[PDB]
Amino acid sequence: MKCLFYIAGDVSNYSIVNYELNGQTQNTFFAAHALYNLFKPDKVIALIPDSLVKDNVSDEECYKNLVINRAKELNFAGMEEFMNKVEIRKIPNVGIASAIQCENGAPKKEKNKEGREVLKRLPYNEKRSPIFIFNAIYAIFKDEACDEYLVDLTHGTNVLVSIGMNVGALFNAKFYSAPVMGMPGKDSIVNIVELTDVVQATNDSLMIRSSIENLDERYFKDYSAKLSRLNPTIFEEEEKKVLTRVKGTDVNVVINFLWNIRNGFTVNAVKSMNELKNIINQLEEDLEKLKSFYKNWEEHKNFQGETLLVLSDLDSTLKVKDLLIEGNDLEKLNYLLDLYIKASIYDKALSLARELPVAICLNKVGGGMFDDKNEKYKHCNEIVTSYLRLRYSGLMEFRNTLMHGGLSTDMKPNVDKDGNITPGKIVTKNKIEDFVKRELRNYFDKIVNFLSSA
Amino acid sequence: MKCLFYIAGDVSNYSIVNYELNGQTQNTFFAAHALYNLFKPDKVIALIPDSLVKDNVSDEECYKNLVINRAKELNFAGMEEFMNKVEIRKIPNVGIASAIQCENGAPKKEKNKEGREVLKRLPYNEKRSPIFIFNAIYAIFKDEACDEYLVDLTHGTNVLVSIGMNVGALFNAKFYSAPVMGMPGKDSIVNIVELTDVVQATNDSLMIRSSIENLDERYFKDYSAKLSRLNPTIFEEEEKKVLTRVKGTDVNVVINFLWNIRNGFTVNAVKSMNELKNIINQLEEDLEKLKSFYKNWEEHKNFQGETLLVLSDLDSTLKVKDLLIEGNDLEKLNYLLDLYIKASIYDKALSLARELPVAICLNKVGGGMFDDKNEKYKHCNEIVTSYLRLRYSGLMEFRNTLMHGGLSTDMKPNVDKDGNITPGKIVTKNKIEDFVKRELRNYFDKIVNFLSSA
RNA sequence: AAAA
């Protein structure tokens, strides 16, 4: 069900500290145990790098005894029922380190220089690839099977913690880390910091960036709820005014813009362009002020506790500026044609290349409505349709196939007695790709060049 | 252009140690300096937490003097060409970390034996949000205006390092980390591990997962090249036997499956389903064996250096198993309709809902071809078209609108003398979403229920 | 704050 994963470090350098989270204190010498008592996950998994403990039979059993040895030192009540419950799973490491030479699952001892000390087998040298370490931790997470993943990033090497964070990200883990000062001591009430929001904020930004790149709103993570809930407890004059502007950013108009583009509502997408231009012009202003605020963060201490205003979400939204152009609605539609081409939306690109010359034609004749009852449209459409069938036979063929899809007269499939269908034509993946990406612009530009003379 | 970023720690417990990267060798007391003369970047940014030091005038100048104070104790032999060109930028922190006092241009300190002990500030308490820290670091990265980002995750608090890693990810940074593992005692040759590949492998998996989720091949990160260029020099009989299978996984058939689905080649997508079923049935077998290999990684040390085989890339690909179903091509197309609905591909869902009942009808009559010359098709199409226009007027309307898009008779826009277009029907995002997500399946099931009696 |  709920599993706590933690990467192990050298316990001989641990002291009793009073870890804190929301006021619910936990007195221990390692953060993993504190988080166990707080969250109380059903399964606890500690990853121990081969860099640490080493023995003749079981390194996992030596680590279990190493922790109870530092529980017998400093006189701690726990580690008997706890370490018995913990599932110890060994992981690979890289670089040079010092391991411990245990006798028989019990770490050994030998007095060197000052007095009794663990005889560390100082040389350990292994060259491993971080993705080998990644694959080792991944397999543990995957086959472990949990409904809720909890990852402790407090203890362990910076290499293993970063690797563990990226594994956890693929299992929708909650991340925790409890950083402390160099040997604090008694009554050290250090805070456990949750990092879940930070890993989500970066995933959200990469998704927002790709959403504008591939003209898809399904990838745009809507931060409407975050901004609407955002409120300054204490606001210090013009740190209240700029937040008012940010809270009022129409992120819904951006999502709708991407929806219309994706779904082929080309006239609506283009009509929204000037509104969007004013949305991101304000967003540019807001972000410069917010950037300046966080660059001189010492003066805007009021934002120190805020979790709803994330700079990357807003900065990633500024990319939508690339989807915008200045000019008449025909020039805006012409730009959109190029956008569909780059984004590999073959269907929408071909339909726009077919219909835009009719509108171009209509404009030349003084205007009209896309309706069969309109004489100007009737003749304008007849001209572009017949000119396309006369010269650009390929354009018109790809258009109708993409428009009607597989189950259609355009593809001529055959349905049998058994309920099985055999395609009637070949789906030319690279020919469609090639035509749109290499000739649709050159062809369109020639069609519109001809229709200018009209 | 190329610029290095590092987060700072207490220079107090730092010893002069040699480093290693691509065979390069460099001796210093902190990894950031080693990486500086290894790569030689145009700018170097020193991110210093507010818990690190505290001066009456400039905390950045005290850190600048703190590092030269530690350089003096033993032979630093440097900082006359690295201490000039480094931009010190203060960052916020969290917790009860103990700060260290500063006065004008000096860090003070007192003897109290052991030579001259560090003047610990002793108590500091700040409760900040990790996204506030994230926004602070983001603003620094964003406004630094760099072409190539390089991030050092060796030094600093585990909270600040993980936060820095997620910021770096949004700037396409290369990540490096060199942990010590114990008492160095000079030299030791601590190795700097690059983590770029690990952060990319997880981003790639999230993209692969979303690609299957939204039926889009543009998001699927192709790992064919990795797989082909993968061959360990020494390989066991059981290792080779299963790696041979992995190297032969037809990831191209999965990408093509997603291409046909996105572009509406529904018959072809459905025909590929059985082939795909075998592709994933083997990939499951290989994943169980590889998972077992990485779970018992101590026996398969041949993989210890491999960077091409990423478990997450293959495991994420297994999600395509959800896109598959058993049954005749009509039953497979029926399932695909539900897939288009869940994926919010309104155009493809409505065209399939319109054409699938014609095929259903054709099957009942013993089969036929989707062609106007076929009598069975002619009548079958006439029946579903008239039944849809009779009972499901809405379905037929949304279908043609989405099929022809904005510039069409289906939307009736009006073109001006000025070249500006005013939409005709302005059909909303919600009316379309609600209809297909809430009614399309119930309506389709009733259409097919009726056509069974045929 | 290079196995808090």
Coordinates of C-alpha atoms in Angstrom, one line a residue, chain A residues 50-51 90-98 120 122 124 126-132 134-136 138-140 142-143 153-159 161-163 165-166 169-172 177-179 181-183 189-191 193-195 197-199 201-203 205-207 209-211 214-219 252 255-256 259 262-268 271 288 291 294-295 297-298 300-301 303-312 315-316 328-330 333 343-348 351-352 355-356 359 362-363 366-372 377 399 401-409 411-423 425 427-429 432-433, chain B residues 50 54 89-92 94-98 120 122 125-132 134-136 138-140 142-143 153-159 161-163 165-167 169-172 177-183 188-189 191 193-195 197-199 201-203 205-207 209-211 214-216 218-219 255-256 259-260 262-268 271 291 294-295 297-298 300-301 303-312 315-316 328-330 333 343-348 351-352 355-356 359 362-363 366-372 377 399 401-409 411-423 426-429 432-433:
Chain A
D50 CA 27.6 -1.4 -1.7
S51 CA 29.9 1.5 -0.9
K90 CA 21.3 -3.4 -1.5
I91 CA 22.0 -0.9 -4.4
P92 CA 25.1 -0.3 -6.6
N93 CA 27.3 2.8 -6.3
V94 CA 30.2 4.6 -8.2
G95 CA 33.5 6.3 -7.2
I96 CA 36.0 5.6 -4.3
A97 CA 34.7 5.2 -0.8
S98 CA 35.4 3.4 2.6
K120 CA 37.0 0.7 7.8
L122 CA 39.3 2.3 3.3
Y124 CA 36.5 0.6 -2.5
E126 CA 33.8 0.7 -8.6
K127 CA 33.1 2.3 -12.0
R128 CA 29.3 2.1 -12.7
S129 CA 27.0 4.1 -15.0
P130 CA 24.4 6.3 -13.2
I131 CA 21.7 4.7 -15.5
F132 CA 22.8 1.2 -14.2
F134 CA 18.9 4.2 -12.0
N135 CA 17.8 0.8 -13.4
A136 CA 18.7 -1.0 -10.2
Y138 CA 13.7 1.5 -10.8
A139 CA 13.4 -2.4 -10.7
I140 CA 13.1 -2.1 -6.8
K142 CA 8.5 -1.2 -9.9
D143 CA 8.4 -4.8 -8.5
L153 CA 16.0 12.4 0.2
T154 CA 17.6 13.4 3.6
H155 CA 20.2 10.6 3.9
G156 CA 22.6 9.3 1.2
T157 CA 25.1 10.5 -1.4
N158 CA 24.1 13.4 -3.6
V159 CA 24.5 11.1 -6.7
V161 CA 19.6 11.1 -3.8
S162 CA 19.3 12.8 -7.2
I163 CA 19.0 9.3 -9.0
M165 CA 14.4 11.6 -6.9
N166 CA 14.1 10.9 -10.7
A169 CA 9.1 11.0 -10.1
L170 CA 8.1 8.0 -12.3
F171 CA 6.1 6.5 -9.3
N172 CA 4.3 9.8 -8.3
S177 CA 14.4 16.1 3.1
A178 CA 15.6 17.3 6.6
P179 CA 18.8 19.3 6.3
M181 CA 23.7 22.1 10.7
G182 CA 27.2 20.5 11.2
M183 CA 26.7 18.6 14.5
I189 CA 14.2 21.0 16.4
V190 CA 15.1 20.7 12.7
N191 CA 12.3 20.9 10.0
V193 CA 10.9 19.9 4.0
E194 CA 8.5 18.4 1.4
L195 CA 9.8 18.8 -2.2
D197 CA 5.6 20.7 -5.3
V198 CA 9.0 21.6 -6.8
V199 CA 9.3 18.3 -8.9
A201 CA 6.3 22.5 -11.0
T202 CA 9.1 21.5 -13.4
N203 CA 7.1 18.6 -14.9
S205 CA 6.5 23.6 -17.2
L206 CA 7.9 21.0 -19.6
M207 CA 4.3 19.9 -20.3
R209 CA 6.3 24.2 -23.2
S210 CA 5.5 21.1 -25.3
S211 CA 1.7 22.0 -25.4
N214 CA 2.7 20.8 -30.6
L215 CA -0.5 23.1 -30.6
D216 CA -2.2 20.8 -28.0
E217 CA -4.1 22.0 -24.9
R218 CA -4.2 18.5 -23.4
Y219 CA -0.6 19.0 -22.3
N252 CA -8.3 30.0 -19.8
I255 CA -6.1 27.0 -23.2
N256 CA -9.1 27.8 -25.4
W259 CA -8.2 24.0 -28.2
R262 CA -6.0 21.6 -32.2
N263 CA -9.7 21.1 -33.2
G264 CA -9.5 23.1 -36.4
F265 CA -11.6 26.2 -35.4
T266 CA -9.2 28.3 -37.4
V267 CA -11.4 31.5 -37.7
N268 CA -11.9 31.6 -33.9
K271 CA -9.8 36.2 -33.9
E288 CA 9.7 41.3 -15.2
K291 CA 11.6 38.3 -11.6
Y294 CA 12.7 37.2 -6.5
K295 CA 16.1 38.5 -7.6
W297 CA 13.9 38.4 -2.5
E298 CA 15.3 39.9 0.8
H300 CA 9.7 40.7 -0.4
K301 CA 9.8 38.3 2.6
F303 CA 6.1 35.7 -0.5
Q304 CA 8.5 33.4 1.7
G305 CA 5.6 31.0 2.5
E306 CA 3.6 31.1 -0.7
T307 CA 3.1 27.8 -2.7
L308 CA 0.5 28.9 -5.4
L309 CA 2.7 31.5 -7.3
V310 CA 5.2 29.5 -9.3
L311 CA 7.4 31.6 -11.7
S312 CA 8.1 28.7 -14.2
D315 CA 7.3 32.0 -17.8
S316 CA 6.5 28.8 -19.7
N328 CA -5.5 40.9 -41.2
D329 CA -7.4 37.7 -40.3
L330 CA -6.2 36.2 -43.7
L333 CA -4.7 32.2 -41.0
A343 CA 3.4 20.8 -35.5
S344 CA 2.8 17.9 -38.0
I345 CA -1.0 18.3 -37.9
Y346 CA -1.4 17.1 -41.5
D347 CA -5.3 17.0 -41.5
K348 CA -5.7 20.6 -40.3
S351 CA -7.9 21.6 -45.0
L352 CA -6.6 25.2 -44.3
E355 CA -10.2 26.7 -47.7
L356 CA -7.9 29.7 -47.2
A359 CA -11.4 33.3 -48.4
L362 CA -13.8 36.3 -51.5
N363 CA -11.7 39.2 -50.1
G366 CA -15.2 42.7 -51.8
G367 CA -16.1 40.0 -49.3
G368 CA -18.8 37.4 -48.7
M369 CA -20.0 34.6 -46.4
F370 CA -19.0 30.9 -46.6
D371 CA -22.5 29.7 -47.7
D372 CA -23.8 28.1 -50.9
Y377 CA -18.7 32.2 -52.5
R399 CA -7.0 16.2 -48.0
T401 CA -8.2 10.8 -47.2
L402 CA -7.1 12.6 -44.0
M403 CA -10.5 14.1 -43.6
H404 CA -12.5 10.9 -43.8
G405 CA -9.9 8.5 -42.3
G406 CA -9.6 4.7 -42.6
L407 CA -13.2 3.5 -42.6
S408 CA -14.3 5.5 -45.7
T409 CA -14.8 5.4 -49.5
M411 CA -9.6 4.3 -48.5
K412 CA -12.1 1.6 -49.9
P413 CA -11.7 -1.1 -47.1
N414 CA -13.6 -4.4 -47.4
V415 CA -15.7 -5.8 -44.5
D416 CA -16.1 -9.6 -44.6
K417 CA -18.7 -12.2 -43.3
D418 CA -16.4 -12.8 -40.2
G419 CA -16.3 -9.1 -39.3
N420 CA -12.7 -8.5 -40.4
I421 CA -11.7 -5.5 -42.5
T422 CA -9.0 -5.5 -45.3
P423 CA -7.6 -2.0 -46.3
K425 CA -5.2 1.3 -50.3
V427 CA -1.4 4.4 -45.9
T428 CA 1.6 6.3 -47.1
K429 CA 3.1 7.6 -43.7
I432 CA 2.0 12.4 -46.4
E433 CA 4.9 13.6 -44.1
Chain B
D50 CA 21.1 32.9 3.6
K54 CA 25.5 37.0 7.6
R89 CA 24.1 35.6 -5.8
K90 CA 22.4 35.1 -2.3
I91 CA 19.5 32.5 -2.2
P92 CA 16.8 31.9 0.5
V94 CA 14.6 26.7 5.2
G95 CA 14.9 25.2 8.7
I96 CA 17.0 25.8 11.8
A97 CA 20.5 25.9 10.2
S98 CA 23.1 27.7 12.4
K120 CA 29.2 30.0 14.6
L122 CA 24.5 29.6 16.6
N125 CA 15.0 30.0 12.1
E126 CA 13.2 30.6 8.8
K127 CA 10.1 28.9 7.5
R128 CA 10.1 29.3 3.6
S129 CA 8.3 27.3 0.9
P130 CA 10.5 25.2 -1.4
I131 CA 8.7 26.8 -4.4
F132 CA 9.8 30.3 -3.1
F134 CA 12.6 27.4 -6.6
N135 CA 11.3 30.8 -7.9
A136 CA 14.4 32.6 -6.4
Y138 CA 14.7 30.2 -11.4
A139 CA 14.9 34.0 -11.7
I140 CA 18.7 33.8 -11.4
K142 CA 16.4 32.9 -16.4
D143 CA 18.0 36.3 -16.3
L153 CA 25.1 19.2 -7.5
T154 CA 28.2 18.2 -5.4
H155 CA 28.0 20.8 -2.6
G156 CA 25.2 22.3 -0.6
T157 CA 22.1 21.1 1.4
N158 CA 20.1 18.1 -0.1
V159 CA 17.0 20.4 -0.3
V161 CA 20.6 20.6 -4.5
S162 CA 17.4 18.8 -5.4
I163 CA 15.7 22.3 -6.0
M165 CA 18.4 20.1 -10.2
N166 CA 14.7 20.8 -11.1
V167 CA 15.6 24.4 -12.1
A169 CA 16.1 20.7 -16.0
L170 CA 14.1 23.7 -17.3
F171 CA 17.3 25.2 -18.8
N172 CA 18.7 21.9 -20.5
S177 CA 28.2 15.4 -8.6
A178 CA 31.4 14.3 -6.8
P179 CA 30.7 13.0 -3.2
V180 CA 33.7 12.1 -0.9
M181 CA 32.5 8.8 0.9
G182 CA 34.4 9.1 4.2
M183 CA 37.6 10.8 5.4
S188 CA 42.0 10.2 -3.0
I189 CA 40.9 11.1 -6.5
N191 CA 35.2 11.1 -9.1
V193 CA 29.7 11.6 -11.9
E194 CA 27.5 13.2 -14.7
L195 CA 23.7 12.8 -14.1
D197 CA 21.4 11.0 -18.8
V198 CA 19.3 10.1 -15.6
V199 CA 17.3 13.3 -15.7
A201 CA 15.7 9.1 -19.0
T202 CA 12.9 10.2 -16.6
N203 CA 11.7 13.1 -18.8
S205 CA 9.5 8.1 -19.8
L206 CA 7.0 10.8 -18.8
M207 CA 6.8 11.8 -22.5
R209 CA 3.6 7.6 -21.0
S210 CA 1.7 10.8 -22.1
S211 CA 2.2 9.7 -25.8
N214 CA -3.1 11.1 -25.6
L215 CA -2.7 8.7 -28.6
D216 CA 0.1 10.9 -30.0
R218 CA 5.0 13.1 -31.5
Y219 CA 5.5 12.7 -27.7
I255 CA 5.3 4.6 -33.1
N256 CA 3.5 3.7 -36.4
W259 CA 0.7 7.6 -36.0
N260 CA -2.2 5.7 -37.7
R262 CA -3.6 10.1 -34.5
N263 CA -4.1 10.6 -38.3
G264 CA -7.3 8.5 -38.4
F265 CA -6.1 5.4 -40.3
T266 CA -8.4 3.4 -38.0
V267 CA -8.5 0.1 -40.1
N268 CA -4.7 0.0 -40.1
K271 CA -5.1 -4.5 -38.1
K291 CA 14.0 -6.6 -13.8
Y294 CA 18.8 -5.6 -12.0
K295 CA 17.2 -6.9 -8.7
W297 CA 22.6 -6.8 -10.1
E298 CA 25.6 -8.4 -8.3
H300 CA 25.2 -9.2 -13.9
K301 CA 28.2 -6.9 -13.5
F303 CA 25.8 -4.2 -17.5
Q304 CA 27.5 -2.0 -14.8
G305 CA 28.9 0.4 -17.4
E306 CA 26.0 0.4 -19.9
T307 CA 24.1 3.7 -20.7
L308 CA 22.0 2.6 -23.7
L309 CA 19.6 0.1 -22.0
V310 CA 17.2 2.2 -19.9
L311 CA 14.6 0.0 -18.0
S312 CA 12.1 3.0 -17.7
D315 CA 8.6 -0.3 -19.0
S316 CA 6.9 3.0 -20.1
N328 CA -12.8 -9.1 -34.8
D329 CA -11.7 -5.9 -36.5
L330 CA -15.2 -4.4 -35.9
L333 CA -12.6 -0.4 -34.0
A343 CA -8.0 10.9 -25.4
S344 CA -10.3 13.9 -26.3
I345 CA -9.7 13.5 -30.0
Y346 CA -13.2 14.8 -30.9
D347 CA -12.8 14.8 -34.7
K348 CA -11.6 11.1 -35.0
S351 CA -16.0 10.2 -37.7
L352 CA -15.5 6.7 -36.3
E355 CA -18.6 5.2 -40.2
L356 CA -18.4 2.2 -37.8
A359 CA -19.3 -1.4 -41.5
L362 CA -22.1 -4.4 -44.1
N363 CA -20.9 -7.3 -42.0
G366 CA -22.4 -10.7 -45.6
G367 CA -19.7 -8.1 -46.3
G368 CA -18.8 -5.5 -48.9
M369 CA -16.4 -2.7 -49.8
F370 CA -16.7 1.0 -48.8
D371 CA -17.3 2.2 -52.4
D372 CA -20.3 3.8 -54.0
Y377 CA -22.5 -0.2 -49.1
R399 CA -19.1 15.6 -37.1
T401 CA -18.1 21.0 -38.3
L402 CA -15.0 19.3 -36.8
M403 CA -14.3 17.6 -40.2
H404 CA -14.3 20.9 -42.3
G405 CA -13.1 23.2 -39.5
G406 CA -13.5 27.0 -39.1
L407 CA -13.3 28.2 -42.8
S408 CA -16.3 26.2 -44.2
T409 CA -20.0 26.3 -45.1
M411 CA -19.5 27.2 -39.8
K412 CA -20.6 30.0 -42.3
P413 CA -17.9 32.7 -41.5
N414 CA -18.0 36.1 -43.2
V415 CA -15.0 37.7 -45.0
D416 CA -14.8 41.5 -45.2
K417 CA -13.5 44.1 -47.8
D418 CA -10.6 44.6 -45.1
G419 CA -9.7 40.9 -45.0
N420 CA -11.2 40.3 -41.6
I421 CA -13.4 37.3 -40.8
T422 CA -16.3 37.0 -38.3
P423 CA -17.3 33.4 -37.3
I426 CA -19.2 30.1 -32.9
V427 CA -19.7 26.5 -31.5
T428 CA -18.1 26.3 -27.9
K429 CA -15.4 24.1 -26.5
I432 CA -18.3 19.6 -28.0
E433 CA -16.5 18.2 -24.9

